[PDB]
Every structure is written in C-alpha cells, then in structure tokens.
Structure 1
Amino acid sequence: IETPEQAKTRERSEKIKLEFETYLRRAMKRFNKGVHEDTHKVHLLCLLANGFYRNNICSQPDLHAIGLSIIPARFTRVLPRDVDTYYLSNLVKWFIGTFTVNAELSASEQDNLQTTLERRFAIYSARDDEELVHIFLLILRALQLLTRLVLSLQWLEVFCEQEEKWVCVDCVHGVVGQPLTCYKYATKPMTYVVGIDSDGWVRDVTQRYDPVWMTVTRKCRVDAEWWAETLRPYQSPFMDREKKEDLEFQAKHMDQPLPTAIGLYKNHPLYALKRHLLKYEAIYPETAAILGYCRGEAVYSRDCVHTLHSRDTWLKKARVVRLGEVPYKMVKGFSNRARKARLAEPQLREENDLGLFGYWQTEEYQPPVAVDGKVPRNEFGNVYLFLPSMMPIGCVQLNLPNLHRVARKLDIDCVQAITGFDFHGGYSHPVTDGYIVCEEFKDVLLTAWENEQAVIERKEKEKKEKRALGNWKLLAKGLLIRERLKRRYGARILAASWPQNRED
C-alpha cells in the first residue's frame, strides 16, 4: 500500500539476516560436535594409555617370579605348546580357589600398582575384579605364556599353537574359550575392545566377542583411518599372526548371523540389498543372482554393484569412455538453464537423462600431441588439465601473469589450462591455472614475458613522476591564474547588455 519496493527490500534484508543467523548456529553446532567427538577420542586414548601402563606394570620380573613360586609344580612342568583348553580350565579353577575377593582391605592411592599386587600376593586376597585379572595375568606370564590383556572401553587371550588360536580366559566366572560369556559379563556398553600383548603391541579383538560388530558397532565406532594411524606404531611384528587372526575373523563373520532387519541391510557392502543403494550406484551386470530375500527385497552381489561416473567426469579423471558405449545408468543432473528447464516444464523433470558410464566402459584418456607448433584445443577452445597426465604431448603449462598478451604480441598460441570449477554464486564458474603453450616456443616466450615485466619495471615510476609533473604545472597555473585575476580585481550589466539599450 506504500513503497512496495521498500517492503520487498525489508523482506530480503530479514531473509538475509535469518540465513546468516542459521549459518552461525549451524557452524556453532558443527564446532561443538567436533569438540565432543575429539573429547571422546581423547578419552579413548587415555583409556588406551592406562591399558599400556597396566600391561607394562604386569611385565615386571619380580611379579612373574612371585607368581611362578606360587604356581604349583603340576602346572610349571607343562610347556606353552602343550597348553590346551583343559589345562587352562584347571588353572583357572585352581586360581579361583587360591585367591578370594575381599574389598574391605585398605586401598591407599600412594601405594603403586606393583606394590599393591605384591600385597595381594602376600594376603592372597583380591580387592576387586581388576586386581584378580592382573594377578592371573602375572601367573600366566610366570610360565612365559604368550598372553594378552584384553580390555573393553576385562579378560585374557592365550595363544595356543595346537590350534594356533587365541582362547579367551575370564577368571571372574571360570570361563575359558567362551567369547559370548565374556561379552555378557563385560563392562559398560561395548564399542571398542583392545588386547595388549606383554611386548606392548595392541590388537583389535572386538569382532571376536561382539556379535553386533558388523551391524551396529561398525557404524558406532571411531574413524578407521585415525584408529589405524594410532595403532600403527604398536602393530604386532607377527604379521603372520595378524593374517591368521584376520582370516579367522572373516571365516566367523562370513554370513553367520544373517540379519533380516531392513535397516541393517542399508549401506552394507556385505549384503548389497535393494533400493537402499545410493543414487549413483547401479548393478553390473543386471543379471546378478539373488543372494536372498528380505521382506520381498532381493539381495545382490556387491561386486556386481558399482558406482558410475559421468563421461564428463570420466574425462576429468583422465579416462575416456569407449566409443559407442550404451550409458549403463540414466540419472538426473544439476546444472545451468539446461537443468533449470525442468523447473519450467515438469514433464522434463524425469526426461533429463545423464549417462553414468562404468569403469568397464571407460578405458583411458590419451592426451593429444601438438603438431606444427599448434596447441590442441577442446570443443570449447581450452584444455582440460585436471591431472598432469591430461596435458597434451608437446605442451607446457606456465603460471605467468599477463603471458597471453606477450604471446599475442609475438603471435604465439596461448590456451588457458582449465584445472577446476568454482560453484560460487550459484553457478559452476570455470577455474584456470596458467596458460598451455608449445614447448619449442616456451623458453623464448618466457624471456619476452620477462622483458615485458622489465618494461613495466621501467615504465612505472617514470609515469608516476609524469603525473606529479602535471600536478606541479597545474598548481603553478592555478596560482598564476588567481594572480592574474588579482591583477584584474585586486544584475544591471547582465540583464541589459546588448539587447536592451536599443529595445528600451
């Protein structure tokens, strides 16, 4: 009703303010969640360091000697290679009847863990389950047994060469070789399980004990890359042992649980279920055998499911689709007015077909060769330089500012080197880095470019002075001009000068 343009401007300002406030809020939320995740990672690292310290204390020779003295002669005469499940069960049964649980004993923080364990040996009483597990670990290490202390963020793992397997031992309930029982009687909800050997090497054994490892835990754990980098310094030198453990884990997890929940099937390379697949993924071939049914949804091979890139991005990734290849998958696109035409006509929303060609349909992009001092160009007159291998043979990319002007002065071909695209401003603006020129004419041109720079280095200060000179001249004239008028001067005239003294 009054200044509609002003009302529109006010509405746009309010919209901009709201957008900026939402951006600030989401940035703050991102920062807070990142801080929380890093705090959780640091807490996990602190628990890992505590496990390291406990394992290091358990490696003392005095504790091992005390345990060996306590161990009866019937157990000291059995070689580690002859240790089986029955021997471990008998040792656990003896250990339970030897040390009792007594939390009423005084616990001083000043007393070190080694001193506390020595006191427990002297009194044959355990303050808590942790002390009992530590004492049993010392007893096992007394016989020089290859044993690992396993903590959930506790029990032991004994390596038996008769089967070459890690058997779990829990002295709390007299449990030997029952990972399910250890999982049931473990600590707070299980997300990570780490076994530290006496030598200090750490192994991930969460798969063995957690039956929900492949469905829920896998998606609820820490970053795989960061955890691998953290555990890289402490990787066990026994590469063959690690390979055997990995093979055993794979054999255990090869379609053993067979879950039927739809949500577990979503985003899973193990299963490769129905529509839950991503927008850019397809099934190659489409005749993949059905691996099972989940509420009427067919299971396909993940090796038959592939992510497909577009021909344009195949070229960007230095790959060329084979000539005549049928586009395996047709998807939608998000682009300029070509895409925006879907908004005007709804019937073209699904008509937009983008061919995502597979890796089997693309061989390789072979860059051309410059001939007769001519730089090859694309359909748009430029060169795609997403990768160095994409550079045509006989061409060099030069990051010289104002090089194209010098090339045109020397009549030298100069082609922009497209390296990327900027999506700012709502459009994918191209990004170019340097100019692609013929190598044979490269170096001389460089010199000319340098000469051009030298020209600027010669032709800048001079011109500045020129401006100043003019200013001085102007200033002088100004004074003179004013002085001149001073020499001259230091409505009646206008209204009646020429055409009045005769008319009136």
Structure 2
Amino acid sequence: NCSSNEERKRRKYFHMLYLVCLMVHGFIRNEWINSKRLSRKLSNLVPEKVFELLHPQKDEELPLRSTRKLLDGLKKCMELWQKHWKITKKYDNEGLYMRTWKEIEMSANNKRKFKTLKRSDFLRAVSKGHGDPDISVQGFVAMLRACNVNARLIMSCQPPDFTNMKIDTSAYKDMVKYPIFWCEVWDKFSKKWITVDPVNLKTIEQVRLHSKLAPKGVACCERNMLRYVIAYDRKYGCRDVTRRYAQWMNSKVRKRRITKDDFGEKWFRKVITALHHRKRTKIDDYEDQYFFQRDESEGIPDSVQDLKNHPYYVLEQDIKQTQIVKPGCKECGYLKVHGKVGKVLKVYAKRDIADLKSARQWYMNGRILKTGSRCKKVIDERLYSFEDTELYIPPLASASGEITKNTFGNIEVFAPTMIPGNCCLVENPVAIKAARFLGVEFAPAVTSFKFKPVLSGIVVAKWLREAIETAIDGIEFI
C-alpha cells in the first residue's frame, strides 16, 4: 500500500518546490493588491463615515471603544463588498485546494486548458466585481489598503501532502467549506491583528484559542490540511502566521510541516526571509508576544500519539536510554491514557531532560572529558553530560608541516575543531595523490566511518594549502 523511499523522497522534494511556488504566488498577488490604479477606484466604495469608523480617535480612558469602532467599520466594509462583488465564479477545478499525489501524477497526462490571468485582468476583475472567491477577497484587501488601514492578505498554502506515503490515494461543497485566502487588519488600540473573512464565512474574529477559519471535520481536511498560513502586508512583509489559526500547532500541525526536522526549519526560514522585504517593526513584536502566549497556552496533548516527537514535552516512557532527568526537576504534567482503565503517565518538559553521551560518542562530536568529571548514568558504559566535557585541541603541526598522526597513520577529523589550529582540511579524491607528488608533509583525514574508515582527503599545514591546491588543479599532469 506503501511507496518506495524514492517516491517518498520525491514527494518531500516536490512538496518544497510546490510550496515555494505557492508562497511566491502570494507575494506577487499581494503586490498586485497594492496597485495605486486600483486604490483610487476602490476608495470611493467606502463612505467617509465608514472611513471615520476605520480610523477611530485614540481613546485614552478605554481603548476598547476605539477597537469596537474599528470592528463596526470592518463589518460595514464586508457588507458593502457583498454588494460590490456581483458575479462570483466557481473555481475552474480544485482552485488552490490541496491535490492528491494521484491527481498530480495524472495531471501530466491531460493538459487541461487554462486561460492565463495577467495582471491587468486581475485589476480589471476586482474593478468590475467579477471573479472567484480568492480574487474577491484579494480585492477586499486592496480596498481596505486604499483606505490606509493596515490590512494583510492571508493565504493558506496547500502543497501536496508529503507525509502521505501511499501508492493509491483515494464533493465540491465540502472543499469550499473553509477559505484558502482571507484578511487581517491591525488594531493599534488593542494591539492585535483582527481576522476577517468577508466572502466565505463572512465573519470578523479576534482569535484567542479558536478560529472559525481553521478547517474542522474529516471532510474539510481532505482538500484543506492547515499547515502554512502566510500573511503578506502592505510593506511587502511576509510572516508565517499559522500559530494564530492552528489550535494544536505544536502537536498535530508540526508533524505535517516541512519544519518538523531541523533542516526543514532552516529551509522554511530561508524562504520566508527571501519573501520578507521589510525590517522588523514593533508590531512584529506584539505578534511574536501573542504567539509565545499561544505556544504556552497549548499545553500537554490529550493522547500518546500526539506526544510522539513533540517539541516541548515527552512521556516518561519515551525518554531515551541515553537521557536523564535534569537534577531537581520532575513531571510538568500527567497524561490520562484513552482506552486503558486507570492508566496514567508522567509527562516531563523536554527542557528538563539532559542528553548524555559516552566518551567515544563525545569524541565523535570532537569532545573529551573535563577534569574531575563524574558520570551521570551507566549503560558497562558510563555516560556523561555535555558539561562534563571540553573541546579537543589537537597538537599543532611542526614547522615542516608534520601532523601528529595515530597508529594507523591518519588523523581523525569528525568535526572542524579536530583540524589542528595551524592546519586545514582539504577534501578531494586526489588530495592524497597531490601531497605525495609534491612530497610535502601531510596526513590522511578520516572524516567518518562506513560499516571501515572513510578517507575523504588530507590535513596539511595552512602554509601548504595553496601548494596542494595547485597540485590538485594540475593533477592531470602528474
């Protein structure tokens, strides 16, 4: 029922590629939204009274009353937009909802006929009031923006699911039940971003722990699996705002994002920075503060499956053999086990768990034991904490560039630290050939093991680097 690691690896890759494209689409669309030609037309849709409602006066005794006025404005805008958008189309096909691996594979075959959508046509559409719900909302953001309110465009990116390993992977009303696009609006009085879905759910919410927009129910999550919710702002910001809309971000959603391993996170942040064309504002901080609060109000999940590979939390039973409880800590919570009577588990904070390694294991991380170290745990093998240890500084090479080697005539380099200070690592199949030809002093580098040493190159004095590299470059003439 299950596919090859090749297909797995392809699906993960295609997922990243498809995502990056989607997020770029957001960026470009949000540009088209900021259009001045559009603004000038859209402003006159909004009465001055409504405009005044959208920019209430600072109220010192009760800012709430100002927020309240802003909310009233946003509702009047949603209504007059209901009237402006006359002809509301159907998506040609599945729109930007998630597609199944099968559908993708099969999309190669039939080259479905697609009317291209140029930039003019978008503006013209928004001005006529003719388009699908995605365009409709996008226009709505244009409108608010033309009124000089700070109004983000939100996009729930649905790349194909890269956690679906399956070979065989198996109507309209259930897909459109929740939106792909919507709007946020910044309340300077209450210092929070307000959520606005003027077309699908036609509501306005100040999200605390629950959002009307986050899809619920098996049917809605088939075509909409909420993982990457991106906010684009007037100033060509790009911020991952998923945490607002995902009630369980740290358990459920983390398993389904590329961000679950560390490589993923690094990749995702690279993409957001590529897409984030402004510099940090104070609002960014008000938001990040909200997100931290949310991340601290999520808490312990209600099931064992959601505590596998949880970022903050671990069951006493999932503590690895090589971990210990940090002295004077204890459970931060308990987990009632659904489906076993009376069965209870001790839940620890991962921040209270220490990782221990044996001497060799540390050496493979380039570390040796500090003076007067005690072991923290035993198995015949004593394990030690990271603070029991110290960098390994290998002896410097001589003037002639001799490297002190081991019994097998190599030097072990499993970490940059283990390159001597006056020496460098040169990794190259012929680096050994080179050094032998120049008859300069060097030493083979063991950089890792196969299960047998992997010799990936040479460790030579830095003064000799240029020379080796020349010999490497001229290896054909040796």
Query: Equivalent residue of 1:157, what SS?
Result: strand
1:11-31 C-alpha deviation (Å, 9 max, x unpaired): xxxxxxxxxxxxxxx9x9232
Q: In structure 2, what is the equivalent of residue 263 of structure 1?
A: 305
The alignment partner of 1:290 has SS state of coil
Q: Is the contact made by 2:312 and 2:351 (CA closer than 8 Å) also made in structure 1? A: no
Rg larger in structure: 1
Of 176, 180, 188, 1:161 maps to: 188
Match of 1:231 in 2: 272
Output the CA distance in 2 between the equivalents of 1:184 and 1:386.
Answer: 47
Deviation at 1:193, TM superposition (A): 0.8
Task: State the shift of 1:32 in Å.
Answer: 2.2
Please name the residue that 2:228 is paired with.
192
- Does 2:322 align with 1:280? yes
Aligned-pair identity in percent equals 21
Distance 1:95 1:392, change over 3 A: closer
Distance 1:404 1:94, change over 3 A: closer
Q: TM-score, normalised by structure 1?
A: 0.64
More helix by share: 1
TM-superposed deviation, 1:249? 0.4
Aligned to 1:207: 243
Q: Does residue 61 of structure 1 match 2:39?
A: no
Q: 1:297 to 1:290 in 2, by over 3 A?
A: same
Distance 1:94 1:372, change over 3 A: closer
Give the aligned partner of residue 205 of structure 2.
176
Conservation of the 8 A alpha-carbon contact between 2:46 and 2:77: no
CA-to-partner distance for each residue in 1:111-141, whole Å, 9 max, x for gaps? 8111112112xxxxx6543344234223211
Q: Quick one: which of 65, 68, 73 aligns to 1:86? A: 68
1:151 maps to amino acid: M
User: Using CA pairs below 8 Å that are at least 6 residues apart, which structure has the higher relative contact order?
Assistant: 2
Match of 2:363 in 1: 315
Residue equivalent to 2:287: 245
Letter in 2 for 1:181: K
Deviation at 1:306, TM superposition (A): 2.6
Could you give the per-residue CA deviations for residues 190-220 of structure 1, whole angstroms, max 9, x where no partner exists? 1221111123321111110111211111110
8 A Cα contact 2:33 2:142, kept in partner: yes
Quickly say closer, same or farther: Cα 1:372–1:129, change in 2 above 3 A. Answer: closer
Q: What is the one-letter code of the residue matched to 1:134? A: Q
More moved, 98-107 vs 108-117: 98-107
Contact 1:81 1:160 in 2 (8 A): no
Structure 1 32/267 Cα, relative in aligned 2: closer, same or farther at 3 Å? closer
Give the 3-state SS of the residue equivalent to 1:363 in structure 2. strand
The residue that corresponds to 1:95 in the other structure is 77
Pairwise CA distance, 1:69? 1.4
Shift in alpha-carbon separation, 1:176–1:82, aligned structure 2, 3 A: farther
Determine if contact 2:194/2:204 at 8 Å carries over to the other structure.
no
Contact 1:152/1:193 (8 A) holds in 2: yes
> Could you tell me whether the CA contact under 8 Å between 2:356 and 2:386 is conserved in 1?
yes
How far does the alpha carbon of each residue in 1:312-331 deviate from its partner, in whole angstroms, 9 at most, with x for none?
23234332212453332334
User: What one-letter code is carried by the residue in structure 2 that aligns with 1:367?
Assistant: P
The answer to whether the Cα contact below 8 Å between 1:149 and 1:157 also exists between their aligned partners in 2 is yes
SS in 2 for 1:175: strand
Q: How far 1:299 moved relative to its partner?
A: 2.3
CA distance in 2, matches of 1:394, 1:132: 64
Q: Which moved more, 1:68-77 or 1:362-371?
A: 362-371
Residue type at the aligned position of 2:69: Y
Shift of the 356–151 alpha-carbon distance from structure 1 to 2, 3 Å rule, reads same
Matched to 2:9, the amino acid is: G
Equivalent residue letter for 2:196: V
Q: List aligned pairs for 1:326-337, cutoff 5 A.
A: 326-331=374-379
Match of 1:115 in 2: 124
Maintained 8 Å contact 2:377/2:384: yes
* Cα contact 2:39–2:142 (8 A) shared by 1: yes
Tell me whether 1:306 sits opposite 2:288 in the alignment.
no
Q: In structure 2, what residue type is equivalent to 1:114?
A: L
Query: Who is 2:388 aligned against?
Result: 361
Q: Residues 126-184 of structure 1: CA distance to partner in whole angstroms, max 9, x if unpaired?
A: 65433442342232112211110111122211122223321112223232324611224
Distance 1:315 1:184, change over 3 A: closer
Cα distance in structure 1, aligned partners of 2:140 and 2:449: 63
Trace 1:417-432 onto structure 2 (pairs within 5 A): 417=444, 419-423=446-450, 426=451, 428-429=452-453, 431=455
1-structure distance, mates of 2:228, 2:436: 59
SS in 1 for 2:126: helix
Q: CA offsets per residue over residues 366-390 of structure 1, 9 Å max, x none?
A: 4346899997566878654445644
SS state at 1:95 partner: helix
Partner residue of 1:477?
Answer: none
How far apart in 2 are the matches of 1:162 and 1:359?
A: 47
Are 1:146 and 2:177 an aligned pair? Answer: no
Partners of 1:177 and 1:208 in 2: how far apart? 10
CA contact (8 A) 1:81 1:162 kept: no
TM-score (norm 2): 0.67
